[PDB]
């Protein structure tokens, strides 16, 4: 079905379904369904548009979205990269930030093992 | 981090220096050795010089730099590539 921008799956229990939005994990999913009063052992196939409306209401009332989340990620990163912080310097260099290894590992942030 | 209940680490030396500066209501360059002090927005116009193991670096403070320690803005390691 359609929602805040994720073309939802079909054979996925709702706890699994909601998680395919950028702003949700299983914790928030279960919490939302508890607030909504609808079971989680259902299918998008047997889903109701009124229930979709309830879902939309709760999430847009008490949670942020794709755009807000990605904008805010950019906001923190542009903040700490323009104010001259150590974290921001590492973000510029494409390097780990939390005090990790640089000598050997950290190919997840350096890219694949291009040989030198 | 320095948890809420304890309150921040705003060390007494430069606390006293800034008390002097804001009681005179004029703001000047300051030299300090304390990376470990976190920030209040009282410092926004104040200017600090901070040590890199080697020398000092005068640096000006800003609104959004609060919640941080000054050593975040003092570069410790030079690296230039290969």
């Amino acid at each position: 079905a359609r929602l805040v921008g994720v073309d939802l799956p079909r054979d996925k229990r709702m706890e699994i379904a909601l998680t395919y939005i950028y702003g949700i994990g299983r914790t928030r999913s279960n919490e939302i369904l508890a607030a909504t009063g609808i079971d989680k052992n259902m299918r998008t196939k047997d889903l109701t548009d009124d229930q979709v409306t309830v879902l939309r209401d709760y999430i847009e009332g008490n949670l942020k979205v794709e755009g807000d989340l990605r904008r805010e990620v950019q906001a923190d990163i542009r903040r700490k990269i323009e104010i001259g912080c150590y974290q921001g310097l590492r973000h510029r260099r494409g390097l780990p930030v939390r005090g990790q290894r640089t000598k050997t590992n950290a190919r997840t942030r350096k890219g694949p093992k291009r040989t030198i | 981090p320095r948890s809420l209940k304890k309150g921040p680490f705003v060390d007494d030396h430069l606390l006293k220096k800034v008390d002097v500066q804001n009681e005179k209501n004029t703001k000047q360059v300051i030299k300090t050795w304390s990376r470990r002090s976190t920030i209040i927005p009282d410092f926004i116009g104040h200017t600090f010089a901070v040590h890199d193991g080697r020398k000092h670096v005068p640096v000006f403070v800003t609104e959004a730099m609060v919640g941080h320690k000054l050593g975040e803005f003092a570069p410790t390691r030079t690296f230039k590539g290969h």
Partner: peptide, 11 residues
């Protein structure tokens, strides 16, 4: 940015 509220949470 919301530092006035940061140092209401921090006191």
């Amino acid at each position: 940015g919301q530092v006035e509220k940061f140092r209401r949470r921090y006191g």
